[PDB]
Ligand binder design. Structure first.
Ligand SMILES: N[C@@H](CC(=O)O)C(=O)O
Length: 397
């Protein structure tokens, strides 16, 4: 048809128009019809994404782990899991600082059981009900086992396995195309989502919110410059060269608010910049759900906002408790637009800011509005975290 442009341009066109349109209408009469007519064209987008998160989690790992020999998995597995966890802890620390510096939120005044649940009691039940991390466990296990079999002596299993491995790898690829298909519908959805927001904007409505948005976006820029450039220069990468390519990937997530749908793009980029097949196949899909630096930061800052409004001044011991709980939530969260705030309640109940009080939900409701904006920045940082950790490893290897 007439829609044959490259994808990214259509999305940038749709986003601009949605911002302008939403405002001019906000003033004038028809500001509450968008909620009635437009919004579905946004909800209909979200649901398409959640659909395709799981299948590409399960499959891509199985295919990724089986190809790599067991030995090489140890090196690239240990190295990465290290890089993913630490940086996620550094970031949340970097956010706490920024909250004390800006000081938002004036207003008016089992730990083992979780680390144990990552083993599924029944796999097909977790695969369905929604549990994310357990499927990462069973996926890896099944990828390693298929490896030993293909070397087995009896010619029946050596055939059986391959067919199994050929099926799944067939499943994934199907999902990579579905993604490309959705994106064509994205620009409409993008236009709607932002529009409904501007009709009910929160930016600069009050000094509190304004500070929040600045406290975050500053931390996210300090996160990139301070941490990533440091590391890249140490190992011997030219950053601006690295960022240059990444701009195609970063832009797509910024507007779209998804770490998964961008996945095929990211893997397209990595080849242009010359990384090896086996390493990026494994680390990218793993990194999407596990490595969420930016989500952590937002979860630390918001927690301090809620606490500062209540006046629940935080001793050191619980500040570490925030750090540790924020890391876990960034992992369990799924990687689609709304998941980031849902778990923010987890950390809150962990420290003891219970949702039973109406005041907290009022404070919570405030963050939830602006959350629409913050979602665009959060995703940009996360995707770069994956490309960075990948390039590092491919260097030493
Ligand atoms: N779920 C988003 C991030 C967020 O919503 O905060 C992503 O990983 O792409």
């Amino acid at each position: 048809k007439y829609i044959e442009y490259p994808v990214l341009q259509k999305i940038l066109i749709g986003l601009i128009l949605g911002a302008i349109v939403g405002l001019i209408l906000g003033h004038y009469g028809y500001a509450d019809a968008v909620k009635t007519y437009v919004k579905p064209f946004g909800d209909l987008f979200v649901r398409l994404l959640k659909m395709l998160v799981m299948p590409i989690v399960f499959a891509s790992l199985v295919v990724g782990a089986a190809s790599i020999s067991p030995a090489r998995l140890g090196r690239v597995g240990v190295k990465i899991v290290v890089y993913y966890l630490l940086t996620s802890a550094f970031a949340v620390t970097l956010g706490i600082i920024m909250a004390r510096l800006f000081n938002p939120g004036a207003g008016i005044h089992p730990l083992v059981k979780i680390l144990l649940d990552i083993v599924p009691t029944n796999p097909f039940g977790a695969l369905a009900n929604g549990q994310v991390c357990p499927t990462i466990f069973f996926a890896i296990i099944l990828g390693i086992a298929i490896t030993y079999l293909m070397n087995s002596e009896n010619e029946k299993v050596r055939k059986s396995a391959e067919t199994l491995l050929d099926a799944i790898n067939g499943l994934a690829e199907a999902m990579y195309k579905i993604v490309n298909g959705v994106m064509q519908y994205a620009p409409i959805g993008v236009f709607a989502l932002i529009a409904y927001v501007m009709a009910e904007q929160g930016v600069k409505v009050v000094g509190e919110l304004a500070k929040v948005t600045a406290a975050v976006y500053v931390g996210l820029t300090l996160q990139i410059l301070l941490v990533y450039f440091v590391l890249l220069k140490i190992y011997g990468i030219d950053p601006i060269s690295f960022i240059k390519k990444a701009k195609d990937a970063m832009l797509t997530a910024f507007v779209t608010r998804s770490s998964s749908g961008t996945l095929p793009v990211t893997m397209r980029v990595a080849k242009e910049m010359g990384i090896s097949e086996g390493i990026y196949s494994f680390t990218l899909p793993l990194g999407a759900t596990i490595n969420m630096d930016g989500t952590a930061l937002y979860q630390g800052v918001s927690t301090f906002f809620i606490a500062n409004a209540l006046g629940s001044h935080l001793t050191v011991g619980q500040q570490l408790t925030i750090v540790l709980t924020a890391v876990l939530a960034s992992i369990c969260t799924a990687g689609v637009p709304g998941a980031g705030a849902i778990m923010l309640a987890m950390v809150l109940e962990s420290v003891g800011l219970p949702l039973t009080d109406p005041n907290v939900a009022a404070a919570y409701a405030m963050i939830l509005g602006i959350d629409a904006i913050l979602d665009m920045g959060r995703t940009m940082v996360n995707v770069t975290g994956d490309l960075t950790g990948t390039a590092i490893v491919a260097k030493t290897e």
